[PDB]
Design a protein around this ligand. Structure first.
Ligand SMILES: Cc1cc2nc3c(=O)[nH]c(=O)nc-3n(C[C@H](O)[C@H](O)[C@H](O)COP(=O)(O)O)c2cc1C
Ligand code: SF4
Ligand code: SF4
Ligand code: SF4
Ligand code: SF4
Ligand code: SF4
Ligand code: FES
Ligand code: FES
Ligand SMILES: [K+]
Lengths: 453, 218, 183, 112, 72, 111
């Protein structure tokens, strides 16, 4: 396929504006801008554009929830630009390599949403890209396109950058707004929604850097062309940060419904050992459960086709593994990640994510009992649906992923430890002789697996 | 203005913009709560007041969700009672076994709601142990045992808003979130000791009254 | 990230130690507030906190007290901000900061070996400080360099696709002052 | 009701002449947020101006000559309490419970 | 529960002038009558062949001061 | 008898459970914070002429501070001698500690 949206992902076209314009940058813009926010949104609802954050919500429909701004009051359009999920790198490439492409889309998107300003929240781990993206901001200010007189029109657009200082939780739609206002950054309950009431009391809309960076094409290029790729209503092109235990971890820009087998041969090398050696696949990101081998046989990359098999195309960070690894430790590391990153205000995830962590560490060593395997499954069901933000749902799905498809492995691990230790361990890990002497647990394997540190 | 709604078959007439829990409390249906107090700003973090609304899959924090017109609100589905026991099983995961030595003994909401709405057995025999916190010293009137805090922020919301003493807040993140004043300083408000009544658990107790009586004697 | 949320005054840190921005940092601070509306200028604690962190070297209590003074806020709303985010150092922290991702996508490329390789050279464990104050090793969660998994992070740089024999180049050089090129 | 029913109860005369009863509804406790002990009306007797409690010299007990100190009655309607007090010819006084004033509470109010 | 319900109704139909109401709890049937309906209903339950309650086991009371007639 | 830990500290933390179970109201407990901060009781009486020797206090004690020793031969000449105060009960716990252990070891699992 030709006409890649982001071709500078390998850094062969330049980041300065002069090479950006000859790449396919701003053109017919005022004519696009002065087609009205009604034409842009009517394009998007017809477009089939849906969010790249993981929700799968219509990106175009989301913009139609905002209220019109007759006096152009300060309604902001927050351009989410955090990665957060382990194994995702799509957001870094767009910011670091194609900066002006994002800035173009923000103004066009903000025009559709009656906005005035746009904040591009970027992680504090992208410190150099934060300075670099601001350098591309200066080149944008000099051109006179962004400011109180945008391209000479009566509509204005403003851009600021708000760096974060490290919190996975801030990647939420409501946590992102709070961190700007100077609070800690804990998510709010959805009512009132940011579409109505958001930053500084004014309506706001959170969109991923990937989602915004594609709008310049869709606005300029036809508009009807978008629905071509993938299946129906799961439409559009999509970046993919394929990594893991593979021949060559790399990023591509394939369409939806790309079969995994075709995706593991045409590019991204292949399995380290061959297709017969595949153990598990973590598409999208660490949030979704890890699919088995047999699911991937007809897996087609869609927001919903992966959903049918229990996983999902959240951040398209498709992970491919091999059978020479212990998935119990790999899932255990995700549990110790969501624990360490949960903001910690709702009861189910402040505590339950510690409940999972304290149990996967006994799983990875096999110091448990066979019925306790389905005990922790009942714990993960006590967390989902009870939390404010979706981090709680994202901390329980990987636990179910291990149990759903790799149940015999956990049993074999426990049966090893019975043979390895010699004495069967009761509920909670207590051996027959484990007790407390002068203030410490004695005569029992204490699992110092809480990162030690 | 008033929106007519039914909670478990009981017709409710309340002012518009009210939350579900006030509507339910007017109909006589009792919805368990920790973090909701009727003189404080609404936080929705304790997740104990969850109910089921007819047109939704997602449980509603009745202390935060504003009332609607014609809405059908359920509170006694087996789905809800499963949620109430799940949340109860989480608060007591790290709670200390302090009830005999805890001045909140006979009057603690974490006891009566756990007895009424939680399960009768605990499923936490973990070998690593519970979470332990250091007690913060905030003056001669408030005796703190922060092991017992259920992170409900009534102390924070009262002192910030009602009392006007902004030195009390939540410092930390996640499993290490520690209500307190970060640095060691005494709480300075003439109304600071009302936090002793708001704190539903033994985390904040009276220092002069410490260890002197049980509530059933008085 | 070292998770302690109660500050104890040290001989190195206390409110009695003065802190004042340099003449340059005033100009940035004056213009940092330019991104926030007049009635919400308090949103600029996160920029000023890290901006003031770099002038001193870490996020001292005097910084938090100074930052609160600048934006007309009680010192607690800054303490809540400071300890929520993991990139604020509430300790001397030394010169450099090794950040070693140990998450699963990184751990698939033998991210354990990088951890062992560093611990060998400096005689320290994760979360410790070297006897010279030049280095302070520190584990870390995902940094984004997962497709280029086995990555070390020093201060704010990037070194992806590493091995225990790749650690020999950097840990030797930084003491000598010969800093390798990041990327 | 209208009858002087106390003449058949055999109670000592002092409950009519010398003691004062109180009809009240128990108030909500500050410590706990439950609202069930405040739904039944109760009758209790005033304490005595002397001899209500005094320290036993030997073991430090709490001696008392008030034979109504541990007598609390329960009702379900306010009228039944007043009618019963009237029937016995008690010198009572009613304590009207305070009524909390309604105030709507909204999640969004923290910013608006 | 059903059989006491049937037999409880049977007594009410036989004596509508006296039986104010009847109630069933698990395996206990209660007949509520006025003081002036006592000797009649007691006699009926003693002599009627379908219900020969020759033996009276307990006579008691209970105090509910809230009600107009406290004793039950 | 009121018992001790091996270290010597009193077992009772003045929790007042036994006072609330006691069917006959034979127990009188008065407590406060000790001189060093401990939650200890300074007054503890059992009216041995009012106790029904029922074992509820023993069952309710969370720390096994109050038990009933197998002694039965303690009939007294005067009734004042049957008002056991905290000094008396702690002196019994020391006197009968060995015999209490006999019964606690045997019947620990059944409770
Ligand atoms: C715990 C958590 C972390 C998240 N992190 C990110 C992130 O790093 N980048 C992103 O674009 N969306 C992230 N999201 C999704 C956001 O909540 C937001 O809804 C999403 O960006 C929607 O934007 P879109 O529809 O334009 O794709 C996260 C959500 C949660 C619950
Ligand atoms: S679910 Fe967890 S991370 Fe999300 S708001 Fe609640 S406590 Fe914070
Ligand atoms: S706060 Fe309540 S549940 Fe916790 S120790 Fe005290 S009495 Fe027990
Ligand atoms: S200390 Fe008490 S009032 Fe404050 S959050 Fe904890 S439980 Fe709530
Ligand atoms: S054994 Fe005696 S002192 Fe103990 S509870 Fe029973 S009656 Fe009271
Ligand atoms: S039950 Fe035990 S600990 Fe509690 S007051 Fe009685 S003797 Fe003391
Ligand atoms: S009472 Fe609603 S979540 Fe706490
Ligand atoms: S998992 Fe290590 S940088 Fe992302
Ligand atoms: K309290």
């Amino acid at each position: 396929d030709s006409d890649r949206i982001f071709q500078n992902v390998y850094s062969k076209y330049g980041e300065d504006l002069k090479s950006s314009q000859q790449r396919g940058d701003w053109y017919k813009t005022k004519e696009i801008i002065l087609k009205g926010h009604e034409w842009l949104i009517n394009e998007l609802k017809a477009s089939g554009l849906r969010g790249r954050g993981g929700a799968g919500f219509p990106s175009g429909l989301k913009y139609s929830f905002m209220p019109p701004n007759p006096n152009r009051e300060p309604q902001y359009l927050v351009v989410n630009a955090d990665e957060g999920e382990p194994g995702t790198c799509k957001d870094r490439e767009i910011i670091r390599k194609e900066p002006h492409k994002l800035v173009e889309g923000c103004l066009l998107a903000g025009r559709a949403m009656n906005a005035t300003a746009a904040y591009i929240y970027i992680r504090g781990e992208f410190y150099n890209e934060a300075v670099a993206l601001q350098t591309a901001i200066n080149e944008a200010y000099k051109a006179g396109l962004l400011g109180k007189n945008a391209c000479g029109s009566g509509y204005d657009f403003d851009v600021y950058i708000h760096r974060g200082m490290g919190a996975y939780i801030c990647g939420e739609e409501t946590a992102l707004i709070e961190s700007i206002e100077g609070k800690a950054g804990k998510p709010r309950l959805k009512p009132p929604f940011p579409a109505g009431v958001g930053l500084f009391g004014r309506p706001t809309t959170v969109t991923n850097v990937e989602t915004v960076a594609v709008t310049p094409t869709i606005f300029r290029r036809s508009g009807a062309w978008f629905a071509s790729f993938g299946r129906d209503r799961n439409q559009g092109t999509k970046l993919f940060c394929i990594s893991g235990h593979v021949n060559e971890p790399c990023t591509v820009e394939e369409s939806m419904s790309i079969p995994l087998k075709e995706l593991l041969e045409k590019h991204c090398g292949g399995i380290k050992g061959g297709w017969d050696n595949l153990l598990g696949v973590v598409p999208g990101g660490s949030s979704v459960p890890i699919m088995p081998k047999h699911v991937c046989e007809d897996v087609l990359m869609d927001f919903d086709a992966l959903k049918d098999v229990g996983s999902g195309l959240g951040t398209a960070a498709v992970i491919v593994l091999n059978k020479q690894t212990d998935i119990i430790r790999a899932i255990q590391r995700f549990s110790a990640f969501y624990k360490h990153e949960s903001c910690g205000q709702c009861t189910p995830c402040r505590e339950g994510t510690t409940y999972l962590q304290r149990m996967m560490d006994r799983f990875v060593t096999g110091q448990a009992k066979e019925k306790e395997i389905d005990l922790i499954y009942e714990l993960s069901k006590e967390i989902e649906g009870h939390t404010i933000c979706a981090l709680g749902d994202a901390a329980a799905w990987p636990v179910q992923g291990l149990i759903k498809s790799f149940r015999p492995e956990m049993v074999e691990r426990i049966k090893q430890y019975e043979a390895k230790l010699g004495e069967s361990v009761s509920y909670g890990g207590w051996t027959s002789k484990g007790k407390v002497l002068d203030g410490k647990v004695v005569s029992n394997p204490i699992p110092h697996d809480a990162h030690h540190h | 203005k008033e929106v007519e709604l039914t909670v478990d078959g009981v017709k409710v007439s309340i002012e518009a913009g009210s939350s579900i829990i006030q509507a339910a409390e007017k109909a006589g249906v009792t919805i368990p709560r920790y973090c909701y107090h009727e003189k404080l700003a609404v936080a929705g973090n304790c997740r104990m007041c969850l109910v089921e609304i007819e047109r939704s899959p997602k449980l509603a924090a009745s202390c935060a969700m504003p009332v609607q017109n014609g809405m059908s609100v359920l509170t006694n589905t087996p789905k809800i009672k499963k949620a109430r026991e799940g949340v109860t099983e989480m608060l007591l995961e790290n709670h200390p076994l302090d009830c005999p030595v805890c001045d909140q003994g006979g009057e603690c909401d974490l006891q009566e709601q756990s007895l009424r709405y939680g399960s009768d057995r605990g499923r936490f025999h973990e070998i690593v142990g519970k979470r332990a916190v250091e007690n913060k010293a905030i003056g001669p009137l408030i005796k703190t045992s922060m092991n017992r805090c259920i992170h409900c922020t009534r102390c924070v919301r009262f002192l910030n808003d009602v009392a006007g003493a902004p030195e009390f807040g939540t410092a930390g993140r996640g499993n290490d979130m520690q209500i307190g004043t970060y640095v060691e300083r005494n709480v300075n408000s003439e109304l600071s000791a009302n936090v002793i009544d708001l704190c539903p658990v033994g985390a904040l107790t009276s220092k002069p009254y410490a260890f002197r009586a049980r509530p059933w004697e008085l | 990230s070292h998770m302690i949320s109660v500050h104890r005054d040290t001989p190195k840190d206390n409110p009695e130690i003065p802190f004042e921005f340099t003449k340059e940092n005033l100009e940035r601070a004056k213009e940092i507030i330019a991104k926030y509306p007049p009635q919400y200028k308090k949103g600029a604690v996160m920029p000023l906190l890290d901006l003031g962190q770099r002038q001193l070297g870490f996020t001292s209590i005097s910084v938090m007290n100074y930052v609160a003074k600048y934006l007309d806020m009680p010192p607690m709303r800054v303490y809540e901000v400071a300890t929520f985010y993991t990139m604020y150092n509430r300790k001397p922290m030394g010169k450099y900061n090794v950040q070693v991702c140990t998450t699963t996508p990184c751990q698939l490329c033998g991210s354990d070996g990088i951890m062992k390789a560093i611990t060998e050279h400096l005689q320290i464990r994760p979360g410790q400080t070297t006897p010279d104050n030049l280095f302070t090793l520190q584990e870390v969660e995902c940094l984004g360099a997962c497709v280029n998994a086995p990555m070390i992070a020093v201060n704010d740089d990037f070194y992806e696709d590493l091995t225990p024999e790749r650690t020999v180049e950097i840990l030797k050089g930084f003491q000598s002052g010969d800093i390798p090129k990041p990327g | 009701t209208d009858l002087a029913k106390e003449l058949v109860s055999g109670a000592p005369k002092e409950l009519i002449t010398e003691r004062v009863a109180r009809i009240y509804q128990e108030a909500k406790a500050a410590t706990q947020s439950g609202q069930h002990n405040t739904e039944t009306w109760k009758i209790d007797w005033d304490i005595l101006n002397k001899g209500n409690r005094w320290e036993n010299d030997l073991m430090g007990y709490q001696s008392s000559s008030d034979y109504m100190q541990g007598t609390i009655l329960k009702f379900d309607t306010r009228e039944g309490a007043i009618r019963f007090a009237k029937g016995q010819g008690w010198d009572y006084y009613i304590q009207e419970p305070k009524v909390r004033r309604f105030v709507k509470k909204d999640y969004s109010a923290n910013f608006y | 529960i059903e059989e006491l319900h049937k037999f409880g109704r049977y007594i009410m139909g036989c004596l509508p002038k006296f039986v104010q109401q009847f109630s069933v709890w698990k395996d206990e049937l209660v007949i509520y009558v006025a003081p002036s309906a006592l000797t009649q209903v007691a006699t009926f339950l003693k002599d009627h062949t379908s219900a020969q309650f020759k033996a009276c086991m307990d006579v008691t009371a209970a105090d509910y001061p809230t009600r107009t007639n406290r004793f039950d | 008898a009121l018992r001790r830990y091996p270290s010597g500290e009193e077992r009772c933390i003045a929790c007042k459970l036994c006072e609330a179970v006691c069917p006959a109201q034979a127990i009188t407990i008065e407590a406060e914070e000790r001189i060093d901060g401990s939650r200890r009781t300074y007054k503890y009486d059992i009216d041995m002429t009012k106790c029904i020797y029922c074992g509820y206090c023993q069952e309710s004690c969370p720390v096994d501070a109050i038990v009933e020793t197998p002694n039965v031969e303690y009939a007294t000449e005067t009734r004042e001698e049957l008002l056991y105060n905290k000094e008396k009960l702690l002196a019994n716990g020391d006197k009968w500690e060995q015999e209490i252990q006999y019964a606690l070891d045997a019947d620990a699992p059944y409770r």
